[PDB]
Amino acid sequence: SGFRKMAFPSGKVEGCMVQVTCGTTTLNGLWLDDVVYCPRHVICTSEDMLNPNYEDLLIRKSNHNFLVQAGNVQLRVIGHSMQNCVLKLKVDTANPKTPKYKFVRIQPGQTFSVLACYNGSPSGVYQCAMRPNFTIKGSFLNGSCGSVGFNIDYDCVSFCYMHHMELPTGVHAGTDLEGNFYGPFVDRKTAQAAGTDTTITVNVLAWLYAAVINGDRWFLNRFTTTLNDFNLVAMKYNYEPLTQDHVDILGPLSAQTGIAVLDMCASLKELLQNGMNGRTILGSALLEDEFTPFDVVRQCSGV
Amino acid sequence: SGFRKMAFPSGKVEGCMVQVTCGTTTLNGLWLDDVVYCPRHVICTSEDMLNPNYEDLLIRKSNHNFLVQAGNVQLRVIGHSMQNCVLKLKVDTANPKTPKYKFVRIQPGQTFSVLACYNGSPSGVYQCAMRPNFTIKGSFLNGSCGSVGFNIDYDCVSFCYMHHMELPTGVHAGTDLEGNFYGPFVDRKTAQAAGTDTTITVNVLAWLYAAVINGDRWFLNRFTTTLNDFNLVAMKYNYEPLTQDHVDILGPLSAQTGIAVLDMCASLKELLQNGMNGRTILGSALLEDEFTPFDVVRQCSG
Ligand SMILES: *[C@](O)(C(=O)NCc1ccccc1)[C@H](C[C@@H]1CCNC1=O)NC(=O)[C@H](CC1CC1)n1cccc(NC(=O)OC(C)(C)C)c1=O
Numbered sequence: 001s002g003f004r005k006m007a008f009p010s011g012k013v014e015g016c017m018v019q020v021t022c023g024t025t026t027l028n029g030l031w032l033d034d035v036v037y038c039p040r041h042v043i044c045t046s047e048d049m050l051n052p053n054y055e056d057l058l059i060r061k062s063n064h065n066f067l068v069q070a071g072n073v074q075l076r077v078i079g080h081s082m083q084n085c086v087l088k089l090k091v092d093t094a095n096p097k098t099p100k101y102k103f104v105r106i107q108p109g110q111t112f113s114v115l116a117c118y119n120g121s122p123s124g125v126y127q128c129a130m131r132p133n134f135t136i137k138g139s140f141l142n143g144s145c146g147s148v149g150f151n152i153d154y155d156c157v158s159f160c161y162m163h164h165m166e167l168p169t170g171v172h173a174g175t176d177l178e179g180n181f182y183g184p185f186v187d188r189k190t191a192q193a194a195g196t197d198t199t200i201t202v203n204v205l206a207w208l209y210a211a212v213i214n215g216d217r218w219f220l221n222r223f224t225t226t227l228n229d230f231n232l233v234a235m236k237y238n239y240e241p242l243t244q245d246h247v248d249i250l251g252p253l254s255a256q257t258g259i260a261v262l263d264m265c266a267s268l269k270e271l272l273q274n275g276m277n278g279r280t281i282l283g284s285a286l287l288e289d290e291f292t293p294f295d296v297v298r299q300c301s302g303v
Numbered sequence: 304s305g306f307r308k309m310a311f312p313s314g315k316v317e318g319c320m321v322q323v324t325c326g327t328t329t330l331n332g333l334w335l336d337d338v339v340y341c342p343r344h345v346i347c348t349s350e351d352m353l354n355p356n357y358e359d360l361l362i363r364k365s366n367h368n369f370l371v372q373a374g375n376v377q378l379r380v381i382g383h384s385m386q387n388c389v390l391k392l393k394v395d396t397a398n399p400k401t402p403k404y405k406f407v408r409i410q411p412g413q414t415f416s417v418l419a420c421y422n423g424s425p426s427g428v429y430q431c432a433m434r435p436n437f438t439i440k441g442s443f444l445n446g447s448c449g450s451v452g453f454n455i456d457y458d459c460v461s462f463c464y465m466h467h468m469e470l471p472t473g474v475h476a477g478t479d480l481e482g483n484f485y486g487p488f489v490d491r492k493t494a495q496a497a498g499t500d501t502t503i504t505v506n507v508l509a510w511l512y513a514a515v516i517n518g519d520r521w522f523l524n525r526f527t528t529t530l531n532d533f534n535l536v537a538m539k540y541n542y543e544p545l546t547q548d549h550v551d552i553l554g555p556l557s558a559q560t561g562i563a564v565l566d567m568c569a570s571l572k573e574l575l576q577n578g579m580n581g582r583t584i585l586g587s588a589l590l591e592d593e594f595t596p597f598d599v600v601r602q603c604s605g
C-alpha cells in the first residue's frame with residue numbers, strides 16, 4: 001500500500017540524452033537512430049533572441065558548427081533540418097540504445113515524467129501534469145532546454161514534451177517532439193505570461209479514490225449530489241466542469257471502492273466549502289490535481 | 304526555477320533488477336557482478352512463516368531451487384549464503400550492466416530514490432526519507448520485496464535500502480544491502496509497531512531556504528533565536544532536536560541566501576507557534592521535511 005507521486009523508470013530515455021553545442025550555446029538533444037532532436041534556439045546568441053529569423057540564422061550554420069557529444073564520444077553531424085521549433089541534426093552513427101518510441105501530443109490534464117538533464121547528463125526525474133493553461137510546474141535551470149517529457153507503455157516510450165522556456169510564476173513551457181508549442185508561447189525573448197489556471201476536477205476525484213483505496217477515508221460521507229449541483233459549486237471555486245465522460249472515466253475507481261462518483265462529489269463539495277480542518281489526505285493539506293485516473297489505477301494495481 | 308520532489312535517474316539500477324523464485328514465492332533481486340541479493344524470506348511459504356527458522360529452511364534448499372531470471376535469460380545459481388536478512392546467490396555470469404556502486408547504511412533524515420519493481424521489471428521511481436522511527440512512506444504492493452533504494456553520486460550508485468515489509472498505516476521497512484533492518488523490526492509475519500514519528504527539523508529549514516531561493520519570502524521575520532530557545536519550541540510541536548552540527552550543515556544555504564541559520568530558525572519558530580494561516584510555501588500547505596540540505600543545493604545548482 002501507500003500512494004506517492006511516481007515517475008516512469010527513465011533508463012530508456014537516459015540512453016538517448018546528448019549534449020548539443022552551437023558556438024556559445026550548449027543544451028540537451030534526444031538521439032534516436034541517426035537523428036538528434038533539440039530546440040532550434042541552440043543556433044541563437046542572446047543578441048539574436050529579441051526577434052530571431054531562424055530560417056536565415058540556419059543558412060549561415062554548417063554541419064561543422066554543431067558539436068554533439070554522447071558520453072565522451074563526439075557524433076559527426078552530416079545534415080541539419082528545422083521543423084517548427086525543433087532542429088533535427090543527422091549524424092553518421094545511429095543510437096544503438098534507441099528504444100521503441102512514438103511522438104505524441106498529450107492533452108491538458110494528462111501526466112508525464114520529465115528527465116531533467118544538463119550537458120546531456122540526466123540529473124533527476126519527476127512527474128508533471130500538462131496544465132489547462134498549457135504550462136507545467138517543473139524544475140529547470142540554465143542548461144535544462146532539450147530535456148524531455150515521456151510516458152512508457154510496455155516497451156514503448158511516448159515522447160510528449162521538450163523543454164524551451166520559463167514563465168513568470170516559476171512555470172515552464174515547451175513543444176511536442178514535432179516542435180509545436182503547447183499553448184500560445186513563442187521561442188524568443190519577449191514578455192509572455194500563462195493564462196489563469198483551473199483545477200482538474202477529474203484528477204482530484206481520482207486522488208480521493210486513491211486515498212480511500214489506501215484506507216485514508218475520513219472525508220467520506222453518506223451524502224450525494226446531482227452532477228449539475230456539483231458543477232454549480234465547482235465553477236465558483238475555479239474547477240473545470242465535470243462531464244459525463246469524466247464520470248465514465250472514473251468508472252473503474254468507483255467500482256473498485258464501491259463509492260459512486262456523485263457520492264464522492266459530495267465529499268469534494270464539503271472539502272471545497274469547509275476545507276480540511278487541520279487533517280491531511282495522503283499526506284497533503286490541500287487537494288491534489290496532478291494524478292489522472294489511470295495514474296491511480298497503475299500505481300494501486302502495480303504494472 | 305521551480306522546486307520539485309525529484310528522484311535520481313533510475314537507468315543504472317534498472318539494468319541490475321532480476322526476478323528470484325523459490326518454488327511458490329517470487330520477488331526482486333539485485334544483480335551486481337556475479338551476485339544476486341534478495342530478501343531471505345523468498346525461501347518461505349505460508350506453511351512456514353508466522354515465525355520461520357531461516358537458517359534451518361536454507362539448509363534444506365539447494366542452488367537449483369533458485370530460479371533467477373534477468374529479463375528472459377535464466378542465470379545459473381552456483382552458490383548461496385545468508386547474511387543477516389538477505390540471500391547472496393552466486394551466479395555463473397557477471398552483470399554486464401553493473402554500475403560503479405557501494406553499499407551504505409543511511410541515517411534518519413537522509414533521503415533516497417526507490418525503484419519499485421514487480422517480477423524483476425521496474426514500475427516507477429520516487430523519492431523517500433528514512434523517518435526518525437526508521438520507517439519509510441513508500442508505495443509497495445505484493446511482489447515489491449527486493450526493490451531497492453539508492454543515491455547516485457556522479458557515476459557511483461550508493462545502495463542504502465532493500466524493501467521487506469509493510470507496517471501499520473501504510474508505512475514500510477527494509478534493510479541495508481548487508482541485510483540489517485533499519486529500526487527494531489524483524490522479517491517475521493507477526494504484528495510489529497513502528498514507534499512515534501517526529502518532524503526532521505534540519506530538513507524543514509533546508510526547504511524554507513529552497514522557498515527563499517525560489518521567491519517565497521513571506522514567512523521571514525526580523526527576529527533571531529538561540530539554539531536552546533528554538534529547541535524549547537520545536538520539542539513542543541514534535542520536531543527533532545536541532546544540533547550545532549545541523550546548524551553547521553545549513554551553512555552553504557545560509558551563505559547563498561544571506562539569511563543566518565538562527566534567523567531562519569526564528570521564522571520557523573513563528574510558523575510553529577502561529578501556523579501558516581492558510582498560506583502555502585513552495586505549493587505546500589504544511590512544512591515539508593523530506594528534502595535534505597544536500598537535496599536543496601543539488602536541485603538549485605545542477
Ligand atoms: C533554455 O533555453 C536553456 O537551458 N538554454 C541553454 C542555456 C541557457 C542559459 C545558460 C546556459 C545554457 C532556457 C531554460 C530556462 C532557463 C532557466 N530555467 C529554464 O527553464 N530557456 C530560456 O532561457 C528561454 C529561451 C527562449 C525560448 C527561446 N528564455 C529566454 C528568455 C527569457 C526566458 N524567460 C524569462 O526570462 O522568464 C522569467 C520568469 C521572466 C525569468 C526564457 O525562458
Ligand SMILES: *[C@](O)(C(=O)NCc1ccccc1)[C@H](C[C@@H]1CCNC1=O)NC(=O)[C@H](CC1CC1)n1cccc(NC(=O)OC(C)(C)C)c1=O
Nearest residue numbers: 001344443444445446447448467468469470471490491492
Ligand atoms: C514482500 O514479501 C513481497 O512483495 N513479496 C511477497 C509476495 C506477496 C504476494 C504475492 C507475491 C509476492 C512483501 C511486501 C509487502 C506486501 C504488501 N506491501 C508490502 O510492502 N512483504 C511481506 O508481505 C512481508 C513479509 C515479511 C517480512 C517477512 N509481510 C508479511 C506479513 C505481514 C506483513 N505486514 C502486514 O501485514 O502489515 C500490517 C501492518 C499488519 C498490515 C508483511 O509486510
